[PDB]
Design an enzyme around this catalytic site. Structure first.
Site, PDB file in Angstrom:
ATOM      1  CD  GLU A  29      -2.941   1.130   2.362  1.00 33.19           C
ATOM      2  OE1 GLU A  29      -2.932   0.158   3.140  1.00 33.19           O
ATOM      3  OE2 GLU A  29      -3.743   2.080   2.496  1.00 33.19           O
ATOM      4  CG  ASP A 111      -6.180   1.133   7.343  1.00 39.41           C
ATOM      5  OD1 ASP A 111      -6.391   0.589   6.230  1.00 39.41           O
ATOM      6  OD2 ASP A 111      -5.392   2.081   7.480  1.00 39.41           O
ATOM      7  CE1 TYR A 319       2.054  28.101  -1.980  1.00 36.97           C
ATOM      8  CE2 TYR A 319       0.953  27.568  -4.041  1.00 36.97           C
ATOM      9  CZ  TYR A 319       2.075  27.543  -3.247  1.00 36.97           C
ATOM     10  OH  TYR A 319       3.205  26.947  -3.748  1.00 36.97           O
TER      11      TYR A 319
END
Ligand SMILES: COc1cc([C@@H]2c3cc4c(cc3[C@@H](O[C@@H]3O[C@@H]5CO[C@@H](C)O[C@H]5[C@H](O)[C@H]3O)[C@H]3COC(=O)[C@H]23)OCO4)cc(OC)c1O
Ligand SMILES: COc1cc([C@@H]2c3cc4c(cc3[C@@H](O[C@@H]3O[C@@H]5CO[C@@H](C)O[C@H]5[C@H](O)[C@H]3O)[C@H]3COC(=O)[C@H]23)OCO4)cc(OC)c1O
Ligand SMILES: [Mg+2]
Ligand SMILES: [Mg+2]
Ligand SMILES: [Mg+2]
Ligand SMILES: [Mg+2]
Ligand SMILES: [Mg+2]
Ligand SMILES: [Mg+2]
Lengths: 671, 671
Positions: A29, A111, A319
């Site tokens: 993963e 998970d 930003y």
DNA sequence: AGCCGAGC
DNA sequence: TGCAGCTCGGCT
DNA sequence: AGCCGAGC
DNA sequence: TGCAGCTCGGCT
């Protein structure tokens, strides 16, 4: 055979050779997980183990189009690394000789999203090469850098093998991944939720695909719904709710960078996912262009996206800045926080199971979500009309039916029938040769319309001669030229029709979690409104009980402070040079009360700190008078509240909200 | 055509080419402000293309770097330029797709640097183009407003003679380093003087000497460390922010960076800050002798010289316990904190208890100058400071790297041989257990042992095999060789043959002194002495501050004790007295206005709040006794401090530091 | 040739 | 600093 | 053939 | 989420 054009692969030394079948390809993963495995394998593991990182969710190849499959770089990489061939049957012990690796070991987070990825990989092998599963092709490496090298030294304790036992394995995988099994998934999850509910009213080297699907993957599918499908009560999903809980806690008086708030949310609310998803959620909560939020709870300070690109033109979250709308605490009153059930994550108190706003926010901003088995979609409704409906219901009147309403939309929304609408932009003939388009149907973005409608009309048979654009950031204006002949025909047919300025909006999947946390399907928004109404009214009742008690305790507290001050300045009591023990005993004897507010909170030795922590200033003339006024005001405050009904309180909240909504919205139109 | 980020001018390449302007912007975001500024009409005569920051300096770059530079090539293709072609006549200008380049950067110093590098690029390849007036600049929703007032924002560069050539050359030629030193020396000298006193077309000469030089100087100010604390301003802002936050648990690096930006008015990209934070926390061999921030997570290792650090969004940090021992909080009272737009930010410098500039190897590259200092041993420096406090001469110091197992020997002034460790085990085996400082393990393996094992096109093989037994923080190669080859290697020198010796030369120890003047130091003894004199004098200031402050605290406690005693004796009452009456009375009894506030004011009506804010608990027995003790203790504390010399205070700090350094380092060896 | 690191 | 794949259901 | 958005 | 160009000076 070797593998040349795959930079991210660490090929096992013996892959593609004589010991191919004894080689294991580890699929991880993400790239970070690859590093951990590549490190845990050491130099000695490089011989029989390959490692290749997956970039998250894998294409569901079952029922995917041929094009999307052939073009999928990740699947094509796996196929290349392993030596697989579409349509080949791997039954023979001899058909196996064309493979570079003998097994794939899946290594994900332990998970629910990890489980989803394991399932998608299983789905991929099952769809194309069922035969492979009969040989035990798939395995997994379960976890809970030095810890890495340790896990791998004890690898046979972390290694689980998937096992195909029979046709129930096929049925389970198909149930989870087939687009034809949506209804089966609804039933599957209905049974899971019901069973778990019941359990709550009370109290292997090998793993079959049936058990993986029904005991592990189902947990992802359910979590997917819990995170993706909104609550009827506050209109939030858990991530959004964590964001608001954190903003309320921080109470920023000035703008905060989105990336910074996201980091702060993850910390304050135990958000257990990638912060980039959180930042997108924050951007989505702040958007205020046409077709997004009717009431944005966060302010978009910077470039949060526009209707030109449907918000895809948002600037980076590093930003842009945000903070709460002045409307947020009017909609979600701080006093009601006292009535909520705050959740706990590993000892830490985090966000509530739901907020309880003064109006059904699930109708205001268009609750939307995609889960497993179910999805949810509601359009936006007008805040003032909803406030008016709540008032009508408070007066025992019947609520008016409501039509979807989007802030600043200049077009038309018409009810066709229950939960079915026609949504129309605006087009008008100027002269012969000229039409002008001044609104696009809701959720039609300006750049998309230009490209998909106007361009094809201009070029590839062409219907128009030219068009020009006079948009602003928040408005649309196209001027289109055509021959009288063509305009006349266009006009003969419907202009809205020819220029694709009508879309249908259908809402037959208003699925929400109710206040008890049960997933429910609502047929009309009137049903949603009524269920919200009964709950909110009950909570104004609770709010009043809470306030009467707390304000009563505060009144008793001030009575005691004032009594002490009056007795001190009169000489009726003295504390000078008295011991602590004797001063306590004395106060008890004279009938002063242990901190009334503290006693009240706890009820939901004696403590005289609230009296003796007062400053010496308290003994002076102005402060004595001030204390007497505060004490009398608190008495009057409790008395006034007792006289009011819960309905009165709700009405006060609605009036304050509308007043600010008026200011805020007028101000937006000036700006 | 075929260049993704380009928004070509419609008329570009046609008969109106020379009337077209290509706008080169500073990054993709700026490109968008420009694209939306040109409106629809602008697309005809203006192209827009974004630069990805600093452009290659082509003036003396290799032919390969130039040929392979993707952005330079894109500009060349877009404008239609051709190498070596002169653009003298009118016929030649005919092959250009654009007639002008308009540079649009930030209105800041790094923006000036990019204008400069673009100018340099054209001046070097096509100086003929500049005498035509090829180059110009655009100075800065709000975008559309700039572009309608285009002419007030448009400045045209002017070539006006050989002085334009010399200036561009001075700025960008590798051959003019010395001229730049003089160029900046004059600038710093001249600006220094005005500091005591007071306060369209643009030639390349004026651009270079009036605008670019501000970047060149700012480049020095941010890249070259101060002698006093060993920090550059960005690093200093980081520590200032950590001190202010005083975190007791770890903080995400990305989040700390965001916090530094707002708290310290850091005006650059936060990604730069995150790298600075990572560099401050690193503790592998060859990084920091004393890391002031803790690396909680993967901050990089000696395997890859720290390049293997994980993303700043996934790693955490917090102050080392050594941080406030080296930079005592009390000394903050002596510093000169800077202001950025009314916000007080970091000081011009901290004043640590030993010269940190020597401990962690201060190092940076500016314009004109660069700085390189190696690491020195903290304990040896402490010892030398103690010798100087006794009036003795410091011993000379060799560079010393924590946990480095090899040798560093002086060869000449500021020149050292750094050697790793290799030893002969048997007649076929050598063992390498240390690599010279800054030689990373993976690089050594790839660039030395691999070629020795395999040979190359240009070298024969030397060894028959090698094996690795490294840990995260140590090196161990076991190498096999034939008897014959080993004898040959020994004869030539094992350290030489195996690349386990490198030279360290330090003839560029350039720092800002305590006045902010750039200075070149010939020896570290000169650094140490200059540091010592300043630090001793600041221990004197600290004593003067502490005598004043403790004195005031003593007076405060005297007045509080007095009032409390006069109260509990009936000598004074405040009960039911007006504020004015009570203040007038305290004056007439000779109570002092807040002495601590009065003293802090002196360092740059009557206030009796410090008395009357005391709680009623104050009047009770145990609190009376506790107050008398505090008062008497404060008095003892003033006299305790008064009998300490500045040298005593310094020695106390040194002892406390060494004790924790021993503890910290021995804990590190355990773990 | 390419590292070092604060910047774009 | 900016760029890109995917899942899941309803709807078109 | 693709949006919507909370996730990998 | 991970990937990559460049500047500037002194030195290897
Ligand atoms: C490259 O290395 C890895 C990538 C991933 C994926 C990913 C995969 C992609 C791809 C992009 C992404 C990307 O998502 C994008 O993120 C963006 C984040 O900012 C916002 C504004 O917009 C988001 C995009 O909507 C999303 O598409 C990742 C962010 O978090 C993830 O999990 C994402 O385009 C190509 O294929 C997972 C890994 O291991 C688990 C990896 O090692
Ligand atoms: C793509 O869009 C733009 C890119 C840029 C450059 C840039 C340019 C690159 C390139 C990479 C980069 C990148 O630097 C890398 O950043 C990394 C950030 O995290 C840390 C950990 O490590 C840093 C790298 O050391 C640095 O190399 C940018 C970050 O901040 C910038 O200014 C950088 O590889 C290819 O060319 C400027 C712009 O406008 C002004 C743009 O619009
Ligand atoms: Mg996970
Ligand atoms: Mg919405
Ligand atoms: Mg800038
Ligand atoms: Mg260093
Ligand atoms: Mg689909
Ligand atoms: Mg160079």
């Amino acid at each position: 055979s070797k593998i040349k054009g795959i930079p991210k692969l660490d090929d096992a030394n013996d892959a593609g050779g004589k010991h191919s079948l004894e080689c294991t390809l580890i699929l991880t993963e993400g790239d970070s997980a690859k590093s951990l495995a590549v490190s845990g394998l050491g130099v000695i593991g490089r011989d029989r183990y390959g490692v290749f990182p997956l970039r998250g969710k894998i294409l569901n190849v079952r029922e995917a189009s041929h094009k999307q499959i052939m073009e999928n770089a990740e699947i094509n990489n796996i196929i290349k690394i392993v030596g697989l061939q579409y349509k080949k049957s791997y039954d023979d012990a001899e058909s196996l000789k064309t493979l570079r690796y003998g097994k794939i070991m899946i290594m994900t987070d332990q998970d629910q999203d990890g489980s989803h990825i394991k399932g998608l990989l299983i789905n991929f092998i099952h769809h194309n090469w069922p035969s492979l599963l009969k040989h035990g092709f798939l395995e997994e490496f379960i976890t809970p850098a030095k810890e890495a090298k340790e896990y791998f030294a004890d690898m046979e304790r972390h290694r689980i093998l998937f096992r195909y036992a029979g046709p129930e394995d096929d049925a389970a995988i198909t149930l989870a991944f087939s687009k034809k099994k949506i209804d089966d998934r609804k039933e599957w999850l209905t049974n899971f939720m019901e069973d778990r509910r019941q359990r709550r009213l009370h109290g292997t080297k090998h793993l079959t695909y049936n058990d993986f699907i029904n005991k592990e993957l189902i947990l992802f599918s359910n979590s997917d719904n819990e995170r993706s499908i909104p609550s009827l009560v506050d209109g939030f999903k858990p991530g959004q709710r964590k964001v608001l809980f954190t903003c309320f806690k921080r109470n920023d008086k000035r703008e905060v960078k989105v990336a910074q708030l996201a980091g702060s949310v993850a910390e304050m609310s135990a958000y257990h996912h990638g912060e980039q998803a959180l930042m997108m959620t924050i951007v989505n909560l702040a958007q205020n262009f046409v077709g997004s939020n009717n009431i944005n709870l966060l302010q978009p300070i910077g470039q949060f996206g526009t209707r030109l690109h449907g918000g895809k033109d948002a600037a980076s979250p590093r930003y842009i800045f945000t903070m709460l709308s002045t409307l947020a605490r009017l909609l979600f009153p701080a006093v009601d926080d006292n009535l909520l059930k705050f959740l706990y994550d590993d000892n830490q108190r985090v966000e509530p199971e739901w907020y309880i706003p003064i109006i059904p926010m699930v109708l205001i901003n268009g609750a939307e979500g995609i889960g497993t088995g179910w999805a949810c979609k509601l359009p936006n409704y007008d805040a003032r009309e909803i406030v008016n409906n709540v008032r009508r219901m408070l007066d025992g009147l019947d609520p008016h039916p409501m039509l979807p309403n989007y802030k600043n939309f200049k077009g038309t929304i018409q009810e066709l029938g229950q939960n079915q609408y026609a949504v129309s932009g605006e087009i008008f003939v100027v002269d012969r040769n000229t039409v002008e388009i001044t609104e696009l149907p809701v959720r039609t973005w300006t750049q998309v319309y230009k490209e998909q409608v106007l361009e094809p009309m201009l070029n590839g048979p062409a219907l128009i001669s030219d068009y020009k654009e006079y948009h602003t950031d928040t408005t649309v204006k196209f001027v289109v030229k055509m021959t009288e002949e063509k305009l006349a025909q266009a006009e003969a047919a419907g202009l809205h029709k020819v220029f694709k300025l009508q879309t249908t909006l259908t809402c037959n999947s208003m699925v929400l979690f109710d206040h008890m946390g049960c997933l429910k399907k609502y047929e009309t928004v009137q049903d949603i409104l009524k269920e919200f109404f009964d709950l909110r009214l009950s909570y104004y009742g609770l709010r009043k009980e809470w306030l009467v008690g707390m304000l009563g305790a505060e009144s008793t507290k001030l009575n005691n402070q004032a009594r002490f001050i009056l007795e001190k300045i009169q000489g009726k009591i003295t504390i000078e040079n008295r011991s602590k023990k004797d001063l306590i005993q004395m106060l008890v004897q004279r009938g002063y009360e242990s901190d009334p507010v503290k006693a009240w909170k706890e009820a939901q030795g004696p403590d005289f700190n609230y009296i003796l922590n007062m400053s010496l200033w308290s003994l002076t003339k102005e402060k004595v008078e001030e204390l007497i006024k505060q004490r009398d005001a608190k008495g009057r405050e409790v008395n006034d509240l007792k006289r009011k009904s819960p309905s009165d309180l709700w009405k006060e909240d609605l009036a304050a909200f509308v007043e600010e909504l008026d200011k805020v919205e007028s101000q937006e139109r000036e700006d």
